[PDB]
Ligand SMILES: *[C@@H]1O[C@H](CO)[C@@H](O[C@@H]2O[C@H](CO)[C@@H](O)[C@H](O)[C@H]2NC(C)=O)[C@H](O)[C@H]1NC(C)=O
Ligand SMILES: COc1ccc(CC(=O)NC(=N)NCc2ccc(C)cc2)cc1OC
């Protein structure tokens with residue numbers, strides 16, 4: 001079995017490190033059993049998206065296993081919303097970079 | 098030299114470049130409270146010991162107790178303040194205000 | 201580690217609000233069923249399953265409630281870490297394969313109050329920090345535990361009263377899952393001031409999905425949770 | 441070394457709705473504007489301190505530190521001015537309306553070129569406001585001009601890498617020019633850079649009004665004269 005160390009922030013946020021691409025690009029994610037989709041901030045994110053400024057961004061040009069989809073997505077969580085576009089790549093757990 | 102009293106310095110505490118508050122006293126003997134010396138308002142208010150249980154702010158802040166002051170004068174008149182950020186309600190009272198606390 | 205080949209994911213370009221500015225994580229890796237997947241994308245674990253990358257198609261969660269314990273938690277892909285739980289796992293069958301949905305027999309308050317008396321449906325959610333229940337039912341609960349409403353269905357308890365509070369038992373699969381007041385209350389400190397946040401939140405989940413109760417990190421914190429995909433069930437143990 | 445204001449009417453707050461006061465580090469507020477804007481027309485603390493002849497000069501001054509590390513964090517001087525916290529001479533502005541500490545603002549020139557408040561505005565010197573406040577549209581122009589982007593509650597964020605590159609903002613008061621360097625009108629947060637300029641519309645008869653908050657006062661030692669009904673400013677030290 002693979003152990004994924006989780007970081008605890010104020011008993012409110014539990015997140016662990018993952019990898020997207022070849023070579024893996026590191027990102028911290030919430031392993032949410034209440035949702036069924038994987039998403040990370042894109043490098044092609046809007047300048048208006050401030051959250052993007054202080055968070056890791058996926059760059060498809062730096063990955064060799066990246067497969068383009070392009071299909072637009074729209075997620076609505078109780079707390080917030082996000083939209084973007086679909087992509088396909090290799091997901092490493094833990095990061096392994 | 099033997100000089101006359103002069104001006105009163107009220108040391109202020111800075112919290113995150115957002116909050117500037119100093120210590121004051123209400124009553125005889127003075128009960129300490131920290132206040133914002135707001136030049137944008139003209140009213141003095143502190144939390145009362147008689148505050149409603151729903152007022153959570155009250156739980157973690159110093160409360161005035163009129164029974165512990167000898168210079169307390171009851172008025173009872175209700176009040177309501179509206180600031181650009183927030184609001185509050187209560188009742189009026191009269192007492193001695195010390196600057197700094199001097200307790 | 202493990203490598204999940206040919207995984208479809210979303211590259212977020214717009215994150216309106218403040219929600220994600222505040223957040224310490226970069227994204228979300230969903231682990232519920234493929235039914236609740238946006239644009240019916242095959243989720244990470246379902247792909248990891250299909251690619252036979254694990255022997256057992258199960259995943260475990262240990263969440264530390266210190267909070268500053270090192271590590272602060274663990275996700276075990278393809279098994280269960282015995283060093284983080286006490287006794288044996290007690291399994292509950294998943295009622296609807298969308299969320300990790302189980303039947304909740306009752307919500308019991310030691311002092312007297314019974315909620316969800318005829319039985320409800322609950323979801324085991326790692327992306328929720330508190331316990332969630334219907335607005336009216338949770339309103340009864342906090343009247344019963346002397347808590348007062350703050351804002352956005354959140355209630356606060358005077359810290360001096362936390363000692364005196366009653367336990368809250370959740371009846372799942374016939375067994376009883378007690379939460380002591382220290383389990384269901386959060387000592388939130390800020391600007392040198394301490395408040396006690398109730399681990400119970402009022403929120404109405406609309407149908408067809410709802411009504412639903414949510415067993416969040418408050419629950420999973422006190423009970424090591426196991427998510428079985430081969431047998432479609434959720435197992436619980438006392439966290440160590 | 442302190443004062444005792446006898447027979448002072450104040451409010452004992454019993455209801456504080458919201459989260460505003462939960463968050464707050466202080467217990468209450470001691471208002472220092474004119475008796476006109478006093479709720480239930482109660483005589484304010486300083487007006488009482490004046491009436492009781494507890495000071496020689498009926499003036500009060502504020503020094504506010506712009507580094508939360510520094511000790512003291514600020515100073516309120518009742519009945520005078522602390523010369524150890526200011527440079528050069530005070531430059532006085534006459535109060536236009538005796539309610540708030542209201543002064544006429546000639547212009548707000550952005551070094552880059554843009555000029556807000558071109559025909560002149562009315563501003564209030566407010567210690568209970570941390571940021572600078574101006575009309576929503578005028579402040580919107582300002583942030584387009586400094587490459588800042590909006591978040592919520594009329595607040596704007598600037599990429600920190602761009603703060604060096606930013607233009608100064610001069611406030612024309614009483615004929616003199618009060619410059620704020622980008623480091624003066626920007627605050628580092630959590631690491632995010634919050635613009636010291638906020639958009640908010642104060643409705644009439646009171647408004648429209650600009651608010652010179654702690655951002656301003658922190659850079660310019662502020663004097664509040666009640667005998668002469670004026671506000672004095674000096675380069676803070
Ligand atoms: C409530 O306190 C107020 C404030 O002292 C009292 O009313 C004021 O009385 C002063 C004289 O002491 C006047 O100059 C003010 O103009 C009055 N206030 C208003 C509203 O204009 C009031 O009488 C006290 N009430 C009770 C019941 O004792
Ligand atoms: C800790 O930060 C976040 C964690 C996770 C998410 C995604 C999410 O909304 N997850 C979730 N589990 N929602 C609860 C729920 C409510 C109703 C039903 C029907 C199901 C589930 C967003 C977060 O940013 C604030």
Ligand SMILES: *[C@@H]1O[C@H](CO)[C@@H](O)[C@H](O)[C@H]1NC(C)=O
Nearest residue numbers: 068069070071086208240241
């Ligand atoms: C994008 O991904 C989805 C899910 O795998 C797939 O059905 C769809 O065909 C893809 N679209 C394109 C244009 O590649």
